[PDB]
Amino acid sequence: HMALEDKSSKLPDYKNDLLYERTFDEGLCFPWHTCEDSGGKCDFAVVDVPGEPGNKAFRLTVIDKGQNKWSVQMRHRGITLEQGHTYTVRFTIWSDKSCRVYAKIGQMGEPYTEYWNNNWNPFNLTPGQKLTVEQNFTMNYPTDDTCEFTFHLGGELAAGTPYYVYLDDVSLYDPRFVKPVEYVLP
Amino acid sequence: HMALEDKSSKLPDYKNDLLYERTFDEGLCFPWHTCEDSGGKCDFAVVDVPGEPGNKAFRLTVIDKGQNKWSVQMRHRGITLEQGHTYTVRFTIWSDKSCRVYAKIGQMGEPYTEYWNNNWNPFNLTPGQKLTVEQNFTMNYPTDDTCEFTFHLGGELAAGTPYYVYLDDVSLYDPRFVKPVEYVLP
Ligand SMILES: [Ca+2]
Ligand SMILES: [Ca+2]
């Protein structure tokens, strides 16, 4: 189905982004979705950012933290990391409670090799503090088309349930990547 | 419909082409279609080009010449010629009989202004002879979004019916034109 380019002034060119939705400002989040596993429970909506007309954010409700950090996630699959390419990972996240969020890009399936993960450190969210992250890394492993960009929220990362975690302005940029185009008329 | 880019080593860049189908090599022709008018009858199909593995071409069967040159046509609509732009018209045409083909890019409706038309001359097709045309013209009239690239085959142009006219490698290139792109997700 048909995806939506954005022309955000604070992100790199959409055409070189491996992600298909970055700003949620149309109320749409696809291909971003949630996962429940091992007892986790969650919901999602795209919602207005208070004080910032026009601006909307992806909002995950953590309902049950389940049995593991990976019991609750928000993710974007369909990611190939290319040997030799240098990626810029970018995102704004916040929460209405004190919680942790483990961000990673890595294999969807076993053995779940992690290609990026903020050097094994989750991010500490604090109410009233938004975190805008920007990091680079270079894929030194063989090219891997089975990757996802995922945030784990469950288990010992979780605050008291239920609560909200927000994502916005999310980008995985590669200067040597261009999305496949299709042409339409019109 | 979604359109399929080609990367012909003989045509200019697909993204700069006002035409959505140029090589026919997949078995598909859309938006190239036929028209029958004032007595004309015809058919079409995409068929293999004998002796040239993997090459296909649009084939028009002229069934009945009708009353006018315009009674039988093969044509691509959805063409905006823009004032001051310079357009390269390209095409390869041939037939199993001696006939004439009138090629033009002009208005779809009354008054049928013709912006390019090989200086009012139809092309003379002879069996065993393929014609590859390449001409430039600049659009000196005001931009007109009601144009088509049409080939007339009826009336006094026509050979003894039925017979086939073939079209291949068609392109209408403008260096200052870029097709709009949609993004689709693999
Ligand atoms: Ca937003
Ligand atoms: Ca062909």
What does the alpha-carbon distance between residue A14 and residue A132 come to, in Å, rounded to a whole number? Answer: 18
Phi and psi, residue B71, nearest 5°: -65, -25
Tokens of B114: 């013709």
Please give the structure tokens belonging to residue B160.
């003894």
Record: contact B185-A5, CB cut-off 8 A: no
Distance CA B21, CA B30 (A): 7
Cβ proximity of B40 and B64 under 8 Å: yes
CA-to-CA distance for B121 and B108, rounded, in angstroms? Answer: 19
Output DSSP code: residue A170.
E
CB-based contact, A51 to chain B, within 8 Å: no
Q: What is the CATH number of the domain that holds A120?
A: 2.60.120.260
Domain total for chain A? 1
Resolution in A: 2.0
Range(s) of the domain holding residue A71: 1-186
Residue in A136, A93, A100 with CA at minimum distance from that of residue A121: A100
Distance, CA B80 to ligand 1 centroid (Å)? Answer: 36
B77 touches chain A (CB under 8 A): no
Ranges of H-type helices in A38-129: none
First to last CA, chain A: 17
CA-based end-to-end distance of chain B? 17
Of B132, B129, B105, B144, the C-alpha closest to B10 is B132
Contact A3 B184 (CB under 8 A): yes
State the Cα–Cα distance between residues B123 and A163, nearest whole angstrom.
74
Q: How far apart are CA B33 and CA A28, in angstroms?
A: 37
Closest by CA to A65, choosing from A87, A42, A47, is A42
Check if A7 contacts B (Cβ < 8 Å).
Answer: no
* Experimental technique: X-ray
For residue B165, the cross-strand partners are B60, B95
CA of B130 to the centre of ligand 2 (A): 13
Q: Are B78 and A185 inside 8 Å of each other by CB?
A: yes
Phi, psi of B15, deg, nearest 5: -70, -25
Query: Using the beta-carbon criterion (under 8 Å), do B3 and A31 form an inter-chain contact?
Result: no
Helix, strand or coil, per DSSP, at residue A15: helix
B128-153 as b/e: b if 16+ CB within 10 A: eeeeeeeeebebeeeebeebbbbbbb
